[PDB]
Amino acid sequence: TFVSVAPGQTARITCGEESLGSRSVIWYQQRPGQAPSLIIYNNNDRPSGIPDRFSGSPGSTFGTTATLTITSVEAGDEADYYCHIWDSRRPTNWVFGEGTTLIVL
Amino acid sequence: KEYRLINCNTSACTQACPKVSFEPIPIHYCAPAGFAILKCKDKKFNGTGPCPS
Amino acid sequence: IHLENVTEEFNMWKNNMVEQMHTDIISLWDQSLKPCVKLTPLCVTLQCTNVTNNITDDMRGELKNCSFNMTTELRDKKQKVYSLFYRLDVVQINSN
Amino acid sequence: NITDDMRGELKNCSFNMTTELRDKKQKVYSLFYRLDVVQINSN
Ligand SMILES: *[C@@H]1O[C@H](CO)[C@@H](O[C@@H]2O[C@H](CO)[C@@H](O[C@@H]3O[C@H](CO[C@H]4O[C@H](CO[C@H]5O[C@H](CO)[C@@H](O)[C@H](O)[C@@H]5O)[C@@H](O)[C@H](O[C@H]5O[C@H](CO)[C@@H](O)[C@H](O)[C@@H]5O)[C@@H]4O)[C@@H](O)[C@H](O[C@H]4O[C@H](CO)[C@@H](O)[C@H](O)[C@@H]4O[C@H]4O[C@H](CO)[C@@H](O)[C@H](O)[C@@H]4O[C@H]4O[C@H](CO)[C@@H](O)[C@H](O)[C@@H]4O)[C@@H]3O)[C@H](O)[C@H]2NC(C)=O)[C@H](O)[C@H]1NC(C)=O
Ligand SMILES: *[C@@H]1O[C@H](CO)[C@@H](O[C@@H]2O[C@H](CO)[C@@H](O[C@@H]3O[C@H](CO)[C@@H](O)[C@H](O[C@H]4O[C@H](CO)[C@@H](O)[C@H](O)[C@@H]4O)[C@@H]3O)[C@H](O)[C@H]2NC(C)=O)[C@H](O)[C@H]1NC(C)=O
Ligand SMILES: *[C@@H]1O[C@H](CO)[C@@H](O[C@@H]2O[C@H](CO)[C@@H](O[C@@H]3O[C@H](CO)[C@@H](O)[C@H](O[C@H]4O[C@H](CO)[C@@H](O)[C@H](O)[C@@H]4O)[C@@H]3O)[C@H](O)[C@H]2NC(C)=O)[C@H](O)[C@H]1NC(C)=O
Ligand SMILES: *[C@@H]1O[C@H](CO)[C@@H](O[C@@H]2O[C@H](CO)[C@@H](O)[C@H](O)[C@H]2NC(C)=O)[C@H](O)[C@H]1NC(C)=O
Ligand SMILES: *[C@@H]1O[C@H](CO)[C@@H](O[C@@H]2O[C@H](CO)[C@@H](O)[C@H](O)[C@H]2NC(C)=O)[C@H](O)[C@H]1NC(C)=O
Ligand SMILES: *[C@@H]1O[C@H](CO)[C@@H](O[C@@H]2O[C@H](CO)[C@@H](O)[C@H](O)[C@H]2NC(C)=O)[C@H](O)[C@H]1NC(C)=O
Ligand SMILES: *[C@@H]1O[C@H](CO)[C@@H](O[C@@H]2O[C@H](CO)[C@@H](O)[C@H](O)[C@H]2NC(C)=O)[C@H](O)[C@H]1NC(C)=O
Ligand SMILES: *[C@@H]1O[C@H](CO)[C@@H](O[C@@H]2O[C@H](CO)[C@@H](O)[C@H](O)[C@H]2NC(C)=O)[C@H](O)[C@H]1NC(C)=O
């Protein structure tokens, strides 16, 4: 899962199983050696501290993959990304999704 | 090399009774009472317009 | 046509032609089924599981996902096909 | 009590029959007369 995009361009990171019903995704990021950190807590909502351009796929779509849309990337966004889907048909995910890594030029 | 009938996916085919035949017999269509049937006896009649006989 | 100076005694309960409406609708309802399909090969052994859903043990899933043997268009070959039903149409016959 | 000179007028026949379910079939028996059944051609 290695995605590279020369900096200042756009970026689309997919993660997790395809959607079945209504979903509530959570995106986390992980710098190397650090603790994790929240970036997205809803389908398209972010808390304070993390800026914009980190868009999310809305959960109202049926039968799609959760994506993470980043524009104007940098060396700070170079991290390991993680998804946590909360489907209204699938059960509770006590483990996270698959580690999708971002690396920049 | 296995085949099938061509009508296997649209309908079950009613087999015709071999007792009954398909030869044509002359049917005469008769009008009920109160109605009449007019036949045009003109030779050069192309089937449209006024017939004289 | 609106009448004048006239009065009749009516009774909706011993009235006729409501019985005729009932019989006509029942027989006409029966007459719209003779061209349609009888489900003779369908009353069959149904292998049903729960619907794929976040199952709550206190409540019940109102959908059961049932796979079964069904005859194809050919009499020799038969297929395995699945569908979805409600609780109110299936019952458990008496593990598996 | 069978008499070899005469004949019993009842034959007790068991057979395969389809149930209400198309997959399962059952073994069920009944009684008939000689005048309704014939031998097809030991067993
Ligand atoms: C018979 O009657 C019964 C009842 O009498 C009817 O039953 C009702 O049926 C309707 C529809 O079936 C249900 O509506 C859903 O409601 C839920 C809950 O909505 C509430 O909460 C929302 C979020 O809460 C946040 O905001 C509020 C402030 O509003 C805040 O207090 C709270 O703490 C929290 O922070 C509110 O947004 C929402 O307000 C909305 O409605 C108001 C009504 O008038 C309106 O004034 C507001 O302006 C606002 O529009 C309400 O308070 C909703 O979640 C749900 O909508 C989501 O789900 C459907 C299906 O999946 C989807 O199509 C929608 O698009 C929507 O999904 C978006 O929102 C998610 C929220 O995070 C997001 O995660 C999704 O990804 C998706 O997000 C996308 O769009 C949004 C913009 O919408 C965008 O921001 C994102 O970036 C992304 O692009 C439905 O609205 C009722 O709950 C239900 N029951 C009752 C009691 O009413 C029944 O329908 C009747 N039947 C008939 C035949 O008449
Ligand atoms: C998929 O469905 C499952 C149900 O099988 C559901 O799991 C439940 O999640 C909730 C929260 O996510 C768990 O916690 C409950 O939360 C409510 C809200 O406050 C409390 O009131 C509950 O307390 C009651 O139940 C306790 C026993 O569980 C009692 O100790 C207590 O006194 C109250 O009576 C409770 O804390 C809930 O426990 C689970 N269910 C089970 C059986 O564990 C899950 O959330 C669903 N997933 C999705 C994505 O929808
Ligand atoms: C169940 O059915 C059997 C028949 O298979 C029956 O057995 C018969 O019982 C009788 C008496 O109980 C036997 O004896 C006969 O009795 C009569 C009456 O007197 C005689 O006339 C008979 O003589 C004739 O047959 C003889 C050969 O059996 C000849 O030698 C003689 O010249 C006569 O022709 C005869 O003695 C009878 O033999 C048996 N049958 C056989 C085949 O052995 C039995 O009683 C029945 N049981 C019940 C509870 O009903
Ligand atoms: C009902 O059960 C059937 C199985 O009989 C499911 O069909 C399978 O679904 C899985 C999940 O996508 C697939 O990997 C299989 O290939 C499917 N098999 C067939 C034959 O289709 C079906 O998804 C279930 N449906 C519901 C609504 O639960
Ligand atoms: C699948 O369906 C069966 C019923 O055929 C479920 O078994 C019981 O379901 C009720 C309510 O749905 C629960 O209260 C019982 O506790 C269940 N029995 C047992 C032994 O757990 C079953 O839970 C459903 N789900 C699975 C995964 O089998
Ligand atoms: C559909 O038909 C197949 C074939 O008869 C059934 O599979 C058999 O199931 C029995 C009981 O579980 C087994 O003893 C046999 O070994 C199976 N045979 C084969 C060829 O699989 C099956 O149960 C039927 N129903 C479904 C839902 O698949
Ligand atoms: C059972 O029925 C068979 C007939 O299918 C009997 O066989 C013959 O029956 C006649 C009259 O009933 C007798 O005259 C013959 O002698 C019988 N044949 C033999 C070889 O004995 C048969 O007797 C009946 N009873 C039993 C116990 O098999
Ligand atoms: C009812 O069905 C069973 C099952 O087919 C029949 O039993 C078979 O009989 C043949 C011929 O005697 C044997 O070769 C098989 O081994 C039998 N199979 C089983 C499972 O028993 C039976 O003949 C049918 N009829 C009756 C009256 O039982």
XYZ file of C-alpha atoms and ligand atoms in Angstrom:
642
model
C 0.000 0.000 0.000
C 2.518 2.616 -1.111
C 1.072 5.788 -2.624
C 3.446 8.598 -3.729
C 2.395 12.033 -5.009
C 4.951 14.837 -5.634
C 4.091 17.626 -3.176
C 1.425 20.235 -3.805
C -0.739 17.737 -5.722
C -3.927 15.881 -4.726
C -4.201 12.503 -3.027
C -6.860 9.823 -2.561
C -6.285 7.170 0.103
C -8.703 4.247 0.223
C -9.086 1.988 3.249
C -11.358 -0.668 4.660
C -14.108 -2.890 3.361
C -16.738 -1.707 0.897
C -19.812 -0.112 2.452
C -22.965 -2.126 3.116
C -25.314 0.370 4.781
C -24.866 3.682 6.547
C -21.368 4.230 7.893
C -19.507 6.506 10.304
C -15.820 6.539 9.371
C -12.951 7.721 11.588
C -9.562 8.614 10.113
C -6.431 8.513 12.279
C -2.828 9.249 11.356
C 0.438 8.016 12.827
C 3.828 9.639 12.461
C 6.767 7.195 12.764
C 7.622 6.631 16.410
C 4.787 8.775 17.756
C 1.409 8.119 19.307
C -1.631 8.169 16.996
C -3.627 11.319 16.404
C -7.161 12.027 15.263
C -7.673 13.840 11.986
C -11.283 12.953 11.038
C -13.966 11.762 13.472
C -17.123 11.646 11.310
C -17.793 11.007 7.628
C -16.702 14.556 6.795
C -16.101 16.317 10.120
C -12.790 17.343 11.661
C -12.014 18.653 15.152
C -9.841 21.649 15.974
C -6.084 21.551 15.439
C -6.225 19.718 12.100
C -6.844 22.071 9.142
C -9.075 21.609 6.107
C -8.447 19.885 2.708
C -8.753 16.484 4.445
C -12.098 15.606 2.908
C -13.965 12.363 3.423
C -16.413 10.282 1.474
C -19.949 10.750 2.840
C -21.538 7.727 4.435
C -24.835 8.039 2.572
C -23.372 6.258 -0.461
C -24.238 2.564 -0.651
C -21.650 0.098 -1.867
C -18.459 2.173 -2.004
C -15.056 2.222 -0.344
C -14.129 4.783 2.278
C -11.680 7.248 0.755
C -9.598 10.074 2.191
C -9.055 13.086 -0.065
C -5.973 15.248 0.533
C -4.967 18.248 -1.567
C -1.718 20.262 -1.355
C 0.285 17.565 0.411
C 3.538 18.149 2.288
C 6.225 16.434 4.352
C 4.093 16.659 7.495
C 1.353 14.517 5.948
C 3.963 11.790 5.354
C 2.578 9.291 7.875
C 0.713 5.994 8.246
C -3.031 6.413 7.829
C -5.718 4.304 9.451
C -9.453 3.934 8.962
C -12.159 2.932 11.434
C -15.482 2.369 9.705
C -18.670 2.062 11.755
C -21.234 0.396 9.519
C -24.876 0.206 10.566
C -25.028 -3.329 9.139
C -21.601 -4.769 9.948
C -20.738 -5.208 13.666
C -18.442 -3.166 15.891
C -14.816 -3.063 14.708
C -12.562 -3.673 17.702
C -9.604 -3.635 15.301
C -8.760 -0.915 12.804
C -8.429 -1.188 9.042
C -5.347 -1.846 6.960
C -2.308 0.394 7.253
C -2.138 2.730 4.264
C 1.127 4.623 4.144
C 1.769 7.987 2.489
C 5.230 9.028 1.250
C 6.195 12.257 -0.459
C 8.999 13.387 -2.723
C -22.198 -32.624 -27.331
C -25.432 -31.955 -25.450
C -28.297 -30.012 -26.986
C -31.693 -28.761 -25.879
C -34.931 -27.657 -27.462
C -35.092 -24.036 -28.569
C -38.326 -23.382 -26.659
C -36.932 -24.540 -23.308
C -36.795 -20.968 -21.984
C -40.042 -19.410 -23.195
C -42.920 -21.901 -22.994
C -43.871 -25.526 -22.684
C -44.928 -26.680 -26.138
C -48.461 -27.992 -26.390
C -48.214 -31.061 -28.592
C -50.903 -30.983 -31.260
C -53.374 -33.846 -31.054
C -52.579 -36.287 -33.898
C -56.304 -37.107 -34.050
C -57.166 -33.585 -35.192
C -55.891 -32.367 -38.577
C -55.152 -28.953 -40.073
C -56.843 -29.162 -43.461
C -58.902 -26.076 -44.366
C -62.671 -26.338 -44.738
C -64.872 -23.584 -46.231
C -66.341 -21.390 -43.510
C -69.350 -19.255 -44.390
C -69.791 -16.157 -42.224
C -73.513 -15.515 -41.839
C -74.922 -12.285 -40.517
C -77.581 -12.285 -37.783
C -81.097 -10.970 -38.232
C -81.406 -7.251 -38.772
C -78.097 -7.196 -40.642
C -77.204 -7.854 -44.260
C -74.026 -8.546 -46.212
C -73.370 -6.821 -49.538
C -71.071 -8.337 -52.165
C -69.841 -6.290 -55.141
C -70.241 -8.132 -58.434
C -68.422 -5.569 -60.598
C -65.543 -7.069 -62.578
C -63.120 -4.122 -62.623
C -63.417 -3.271 -58.944
C -60.152 -2.465 -57.182
C -61.714 -2.749 -53.732
C -62.001 0.960 -52.950
C -64.690 3.428 -53.941
C -68.214 3.079 -55.339
C -69.191 -0.274 -56.864
C -72.047 -0.154 -59.400
C -73.437 -3.723 -59.202
C -82.742 13.388 -10.945
C -83.832 15.126 -7.748
C -87.285 14.104 -6.586
C -90.082 16.014 -4.866
C -92.417 15.355 -1.910
C -91.251 11.753 -1.625
C -90.010 9.643 1.279
C -88.829 6.033 1.422
C -87.594 4.088 4.442
C -84.024 2.861 4.077
C -81.949 0.289 5.931
C -78.249 -0.204 5.313
C -78.083 -3.399 7.360
C -80.686 -5.612 5.669
C -79.764 -4.043 2.328
C -78.983 -6.129 -0.738
C -76.143 -5.502 -3.264
C -73.463 -5.215 -0.596
C -73.524 -9.016 -0.545
C -73.431 -8.846 -4.345
C -70.435 -6.503 -4.185
C -68.646 -8.868 -1.791
C -69.316 -11.949 -3.920
C -68.389 -10.082 -7.111
C -65.100 -8.815 -5.692
C -64.162 -12.231 -4.268
C -64.934 -14.054 -7.519
C -63.218 -11.370 -9.612
C -60.196 -11.601 -7.309
C -60.170 -15.359 -7.871
C -60.444 -14.800 -11.629
C -57.218 -12.759 -11.714
C -55.151 -15.730 -10.526
C -55.875 -18.504 -13.038
C -53.332 -17.228 -15.637
C -50.732 -16.782 -12.918
C -48.169 -19.222 -11.555
C -48.714 -21.875 -8.897
C -45.751 -22.375 -6.581
C -45.763 -26.163 -6.649
C -41.944 -26.651 -6.822
C -41.372 -24.029 -4.113
C -42.666 -25.628 -0.906
C -39.250 -27.139 -0.322
C -36.452 -27.660 2.196
C -35.162 -24.173 3.015
C -31.651 -23.767 4.411
C -32.050 -20.403 6.135
C -29.528 -18.336 8.062
C -29.811 -14.929 9.682
C -29.677 -11.875 7.455
C -26.212 -10.327 7.275
C -26.755 -7.571 9.831
C -25.483 -6.367 13.192
C -27.481 -8.871 15.221
C -29.071 -7.806 18.503
C -29.712 -10.797 20.749
C -32.620 -9.137 22.572
C -34.522 -8.269 19.384
C -34.949 -10.498 16.330
C -33.980 -10.055 12.713
C -37.102 -9.742 10.587
C -35.279 -11.116 7.533
C -34.028 -14.652 7.006
C -31.659 -15.418 4.139
C -32.666 -18.798 2.688
C -30.838 -20.896 0.094
C -32.412 -23.993 -1.431
C -32.508 -26.482 -4.270
C -34.626 -25.278 -7.171
C -35.442 -26.961 -10.461
C -34.013 -25.235 -13.515
C -35.801 -25.053 -16.847
C -34.253 -28.471 -17.550
C -35.576 -31.451 -15.617
C -32.169 -33.090 -15.226
C -30.159 -30.181 -13.838
C -31.119 -28.420 -10.613
C -29.550 -25.304 -9.128
C -28.820 -23.718 -5.755
C -30.446 -20.320 -5.306
C -30.957 -17.944 -2.377
C -33.490 -15.287 -1.410
C -34.802 -13.253 1.528
C -38.012 -13.704 3.507
C -39.641 -12.429 6.673
C -40.259 -14.287 9.922
C -43.993 -14.293 9.262
C -43.761 -16.648 6.255
C -41.311 -19.313 7.456
C -41.423 -21.752 10.357
C -38.889 -24.155 11.802
C -39.430 -27.820 11.008
C -37.925 -30.358 13.393
C -27.841 -28.609 15.083
C -29.057 -27.921 11.551
C -55.012 -67.360 7.901
C -54.201 -68.155 4.285
C -56.001 -70.930 2.421
C -53.949 -72.230 -0.495
C -57.022 -73.351 -2.456
C -58.814 -69.995 -2.198
C -57.285 -66.529 -2.593
C -57.051 -63.548 -0.286
C -58.954 -60.598 -1.725
C -56.733 -58.014 -0.014
C -53.132 -57.171 -0.837
C -51.154 -55.013 1.582
C -48.960 -52.624 -0.425
C -46.240 -50.297 0.862
C -44.593 -47.783 -1.448
C -42.565 -44.622 -1.900
C -44.696 -41.490 -1.782
C -43.735 -37.840 -2.088
C -44.400 -35.820 1.051
C -45.644 -32.242 1.097
C -41.975 -31.245 0.796
C -40.369 -31.881 -2.579
C -37.066 -33.147 -1.183
C -38.250 -35.645 1.425
C -40.175 -38.782 0.489
C -41.800 -41.293 2.823
C -42.684 -44.982 2.969
C -46.416 -45.498 3.412
C -48.658 -48.564 3.252
C -52.266 -49.291 2.338
C -54.695 -52.084 1.463
C -56.228 -52.860 -1.924
C -58.206 -55.573 -3.664
C -57.034 -58.011 -6.324
C -59.259 -56.300 -8.884
C -57.281 -53.017 -8.834
C -53.646 -54.169 -9.020
C -51.681 -56.320 -11.443
C -48.310 -58.017 -11.272
C -45.619 -56.488 -13.455
C -42.740 -58.715 -14.526
C -38.453 -63.770 -6.624
C -39.615 -60.231 -5.881
C -42.547 9.795 9.839
O -42.146 10.540 10.962
C -40.864 10.152 11.479
C -40.624 11.009 12.695
O -41.758 11.813 12.988
C -39.780 10.307 10.409
O -38.590 9.722 10.925
C -37.501 10.618 10.654
O -36.984 10.325 9.362
C -35.904 11.174 8.944
C -35.514 10.706 7.564
O -35.828 9.332 7.389
C -34.741 11.113 9.935
O -33.831 12.128 9.529
C -32.478 11.681 9.678
O -32.020 12.291 10.846
C -30.700 11.997 11.244
C -30.492 12.798 12.487
O -30.549 14.154 12.090
C -30.351 15.026 13.216
O -28.977 15.149 13.531
C -28.132 15.631 12.455
C -26.705 15.613 12.950
O -26.709 15.949 14.328
C -25.749 17.009 14.521
O -26.349 18.284 14.269
C -27.379 18.719 15.197
C -27.889 20.062 14.710
O -28.944 19.834 13.783
C -26.787 18.787 16.614
O -27.808 19.144 17.529
C -26.203 17.417 17.003
O -25.634 17.489 18.306
C -25.183 16.903 15.971
O -24.020 17.713 16.133
C -28.615 17.025 12.016
O -27.887 17.424 10.873
C -30.128 16.991 11.687
O -30.579 18.291 11.397
C -31.033 18.282 10.033
O -32.456 18.232 9.987
C -33.163 19.396 10.477
C -34.641 19.105 10.347
O -35.317 20.330 10.100
C -32.716 20.626 9.666
O -33.386 21.779 10.137
C -31.199 20.797 9.822
O -30.764 21.960 9.132
C -30.458 19.554 9.340
O -30.659 19.519 7.925
C -30.954 16.379 12.810
O -30.883 17.318 13.868
C -29.732 12.440 10.140
O -28.435 12.018 10.522
C -30.167 11.854 8.757
O -29.395 12.402 7.688
C -28.244 11.599 7.327
O -28.579 10.245 6.942
C -29.246 10.013 5.661
C -29.309 8.512 5.459
O -28.002 7.986 5.676
C -28.485 10.711 4.538
O -29.220 10.579 3.336
C -28.325 12.188 4.883
O -27.721 12.877 3.799
C -27.551 12.378 6.189
O -26.232 11.901 5.971
C -25.355 13.041 6.111
O -25.189 13.429 7.501
C -24.285 12.654 8.371
C -24.138 13.423 9.672
O -22.787 13.329 10.113
C -22.951 12.429 7.652
O -22.081 11.648 8.460
C -23.265 11.732 6.325
O -22.078 11.302 5.700
C -24.009 12.680 5.444
O -23.155 13.799 5.431
C -23.149 14.404 4.140
O -24.110 15.421 4.099
C -23.976 16.436 5.134
C -25.142 17.389 4.987
O -26.337 16.665 5.278
C -22.593 17.119 5.012
O -22.403 17.996 6.105
C -21.478 16.044 5.007
O -20.210 16.658 4.832
C -21.737 14.960 3.951
O -21.609 15.612 2.696
C -31.648 12.112 8.477
O -31.769 13.504 8.282
C -35.220 11.349 11.366
O -34.196 11.090 12.320
C -36.402 10.440 11.690
N -36.858 10.609 13.067
C -37.366 11.722 13.626
C -37.749 11.598 15.069
O -37.534 12.772 13.004
C -40.192 9.623 9.107
O -39.299 9.943 8.047
C -41.592 10.052 8.699
N -42.014 9.366 7.490
C -42.713 9.975 6.527
C -43.070 9.136 5.341
O -43.047 11.151 6.615
C -24.282 -3.632 16.983
O -25.213 -4.177 17.908
C -24.662 -4.351 19.222
C -25.707 -5.067 20.043
O -25.491 -6.471 20.023
C -24.247 -3.001 19.805
O -23.532 -3.272 21.004
C -23.949 -2.455 22.096
O -23.278 -1.193 22.099
C -23.546 -0.340 23.223
C -22.809 0.951 22.960
O -22.207 0.945 21.673
C -23.084 -1.050 24.487
O -23.199 -0.233 25.652
C -24.524 0.131 26.101
O -24.708 1.540 25.985
C -25.966 2.073 26.486
C -25.978 3.573 26.248
O -25.479 4.231 27.412
C -26.116 1.718 27.972
O -27.369 2.190 28.441
C -26.015 0.197 28.148
O -26.127 -0.136 29.520
C -27.166 -1.119 29.694
O -26.683 -2.425 29.424
C -25.583 -2.897 30.267
C -25.234 -4.306 29.821
O -24.716 -4.244 28.498
C -25.990 -2.828 31.756
O -24.863 -3.116 32.564
C -26.530 -1.423 32.100
O -26.938 -1.376 33.463
C -27.658 -0.994 31.150
O -28.753 -1.875 31.410
C -24.711 -0.347 27.569
O -23.668 0.141 28.397
C -23.833 -2.370 24.613
O -23.381 -3.069 25.767
C -23.611 -3.233 23.371
N -24.401 -4.452 23.445
C -23.966 -5.576 24.023
C -24.917 -6.736 24.002
O -22.859 -5.653 24.546
C -23.323 -2.258 18.844
O -23.122 -0.921 19.285
C -23.889 -2.228 17.424
N -22.923 -1.652 16.509
C -23.241 -0.700 15.630
C -22.122 -0.207 14.763
O -24.378 -0.257 15.540
C -56.490 -71.848 8.907
O -56.611 -72.341 7.573
C -56.160 -73.695 7.421
C -56.238 -74.017 5.947
O -54.971 -73.853 5.326
C -56.991 -74.633 8.295
O -56.383 -75.918 8.246
C -57.322 -76.957 7.959
O -57.996 -77.423 9.139
C -58.878 -78.542 8.963
C -59.521 -78.794 10.305
O -59.195 -77.767 11.231
C -58.065 -79.724 8.454
O -58.827 -80.928 8.368
C -59.892 -81.012 7.394
O -61.151 -81.146 8.054
C -62.313 -81.366 7.205
C -63.548 -81.440 8.086
O -63.752 -82.795 8.483
C -62.103 -82.644 6.388
O -63.223 -82.845 5.539
C -60.817 -82.510 5.560
O -60.604 -83.692 4.804
C -60.368 -83.351 3.422
O -59.014 -82.982 3.212
C -58.014 -84.000 3.526
C -56.650 -83.400 3.255
O -56.469 -82.294 4.131
C -58.282 -85.274 2.699
O -57.408 -86.300 3.134
C -59.750 -85.726 2.872
O -60.009 -86.876 2.073
C -60.742 -84.588 2.578
O -60.630 -84.317 1.179
C -59.606 -82.208 6.446
O -59.338 -83.388 7.187
C -57.408 -79.337 7.135
O -56.618 -80.418 6.653
C -56.527 -78.101 7.323
N -55.956 -77.684 6.053
C -54.775 -78.115 5.601
C -54.343 -77.576 4.270
O -54.088 -78.910 6.234
C -56.998 -74.149 9.742
O -57.919 -74.909 10.514
C -57.372 -72.670 9.833
N -57.260 -72.202 11.201
C -58.188 -71.434 11.776
C -57.924 -71.039 13.198
O -59.194 -71.076 11.178
C -27.562 -14.594 1.575
O -26.747 -15.760 1.532
C -26.105 -15.953 0.267
C -25.483 -17.331 0.301
O -26.446 -18.331 -0.002
C -25.111 -14.817 0.047
O -24.481 -14.957 -1.220
C -23.049 -14.964 -1.023
O -22.573 -13.718 -0.473
C -21.157 -13.688 -0.230
C -20.851 -12.331 0.349
O -20.728 -11.361 -0.682
C -20.386 -13.961 -1.522
O -18.999 -14.055 -1.219
C -20.866 -15.250 -2.180
O -20.233 -15.424 -3.443
C -22.377 -15.215 -2.366
N -22.854 -16.444 -2.975
C -23.837 -16.469 -3.882
C -24.208 -17.819 -4.414
O -24.403 -15.445 -4.253
C -25.850 -13.486 0.091
O -24.927 -12.406 0.023
C -26.695 -13.346 1.360
N -27.531 -12.163 1.272
C -27.881 -11.436 2.334
C -28.751 -10.250 2.059
O -27.513 -11.725 3.465
C -29.137 -16.575 14.124
O -30.507 -16.897 14.398
C -30.680 -17.714 15.565
C -32.140 -18.093 15.622
O -32.472 -19.025 14.601
C -30.201 -16.958 16.802
O -30.318 -17.812 17.936
C -30.990 -17.180 19.053
O -31.499 -15.861 18.742
C -32.170 -15.209 19.831
C -32.686 -13.894 19.294
O -32.287 -13.696 17.943
C -31.209 -15.040 21.005
O -31.903 -14.467 22.106
C -30.637 -16.392 21.412
O -29.660 -16.213 22.429
C -29.997 -17.092 20.215
N -29.509 -18.409 20.591
C -28.232 -18.652 20.900
C -27.901 -20.068 21.261
O -27.381 -17.767 20.888
C -28.749 -16.528 16.627
O -28.349 -15.680 17.697
C -28.546 -15.782 15.302
N -27.143 -15.427 15.097
C -26.102 -16.270 14.951
C -24.770 -15.615 14.760
O -26.218 -17.497 14.969
C -29.153 -28.510 -2.698
O -28.829 -29.780 -3.264
C -27.620 -30.380 -2.784
C -27.460 -31.662 -3.562
O -28.434 -32.610 -3.146
C -27.717 -30.620 -1.280
O -26.437 -31.036 -0.822
C -26.476 -32.258 -0.066
O -26.793 -32.037 1.318
C -26.842 -33.238 2.104
C -27.282 -32.833 3.491
O -26.502 -31.752 3.984
C -25.478 -33.921 2.089
O -25.563 -35.149 2.802
C -25.033 -34.184 0.656
O -23.698 -34.678 0.657
C -25.095 -32.906 -0.180
N -24.763 -33.186 -1.568
C -24.116 -32.321 -2.356
C -23.857 -32.776 -3.759
O -23.768 -31.215 -1.955
C -28.075 -29.331 -0.552
O -28.350 -29.602 0.817
C -29.296 -28.641 -1.171
N -29.566 -27.363 -0.518
C -28.755 -26.288 -0.476
C -29.287 -25.112 0.280
O -27.652 -26.250 -1.028
C -48.891 -64.965 -0.730
O -49.468 -64.757 -2.026
C -48.908 -65.609 -3.038
C -49.481 -65.152 -4.358
O -48.814 -63.989 -4.830
C -49.213 -67.070 -2.712
O -48.592 -67.895 -3.693
C -49.500 -68.867 -4.271
O -50.871 -68.698 -3.833
C -51.796 -69.648 -4.389
C -53.164 -69.274 -3.867
O -53.078 -68.283 -2.851
C -51.378 -71.067 -4.006
O -52.249 -72.000 -4.635
C -49.944 -71.331 -4.444
O -49.526 -72.610 -3.984
C -49.006 -70.263 -3.886
N -47.646 -70.484 -4.347
C -46.715 -71.086 -3.601
C -45.361 -71.228 -4.228
O -46.955 -71.499 -2.471
C -48.679 -67.422 -1.328
O -49.106 -68.726 -0.950
C -49.153 -66.413 -0.272
N -48.579 -66.702 1.039
C -47.278 -66.668 1.385
C -46.984 -67.015 2.811
O -46.377 -66.372 0.597
C -39.006 -46.687 -1.021
O -37.773 -46.017 -1.281
C -36.590 -46.720 -0.886
C -35.439 -45.795 -1.192
O -35.217 -45.748 -2.595
C -36.495 -48.041 -1.642
O -35.415 -48.777 -1.083
C -34.458 -49.224 -2.062
O -34.838 -50.460 -2.700
C -33.898 -50.915 -3.687
C -34.490 -52.152 -4.316
O -34.873 -53.100 -3.330
C -32.543 -51.172 -3.031
O -31.602 -51.541 -4.032
C -32.058 -49.929 -2.296
O -30.885 -50.245 -1.556
C -33.126 -49.411 -1.333
N -32.693 -48.172 -0.708
C -33.011 -47.837 0.545
C -32.482 -46.522 1.029
O -33.711 -48.557 1.250
C -37.762 -48.862 -1.454
O -37.740 -49.999 -2.310
C -39.025 -48.047 -1.750
N -40.232 -48.818 -1.464
C -40.612 -49.312 -0.270
C -41.897 -50.079 -0.271
O -39.966 -49.148 0.767
